[PDB]
Structure 1
Amino acid sequence: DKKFHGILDQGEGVLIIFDEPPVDKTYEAALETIQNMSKVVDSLYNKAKKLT
């Protein structure tokens, strides 16, 4: 339930605690611009197809 940043081990009986990285933001916004650039080439693709 994300109350806690941890992980457990059955073969060890051991609770392990790690921290949280705020890093994954540049790559997330990177690929969404590629989704927008997919459509503007499609908007140019029929533009050349409708007339050379």
Structure 2
Amino acid sequence: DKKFHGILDQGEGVLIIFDEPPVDKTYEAALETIQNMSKVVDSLYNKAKKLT
């Protein structure tokens, strides 16, 4: 339920506490431009198919 930052083990019966990087904002917005770049190339090939 994401109330906590941790993990458990059964081989040792052990609770472990860690942290995480919030710096995904570069790579998140990186591939969202590819979705914009996918739509323009689909538009250009449609324009190039319309006339040689």
- TM-score, normalised with respect to structure 1: 0.92
Give the superposition deviation at 1:24: 1.2
2:21 and 2:38 mapped to 1: Cα distance? 30
1:25 and 1:9 mapped to 2: Cα distance? 31
Give aligned pairs, total: 52
SS at match of 1:31: helix
Give the superposition deviation at 1:21: 1.0
- Is 2:51 the counterpart of 1:43? no
Gaps (5+ residues) in structure 1?
none
Moved over 4 A (4+): none
1:1-52 per-position Cα deviation (integer Å, ceiling 9, x unaligned): 0000000000101100001211111111111110110110111101011011
Gaps (5+ residues) in structure 2?
none
Q: What is the Cα-based RMSD across aligned positions, in Å?
A: 0.8
Percent sequence identity over aligned pairs: 100
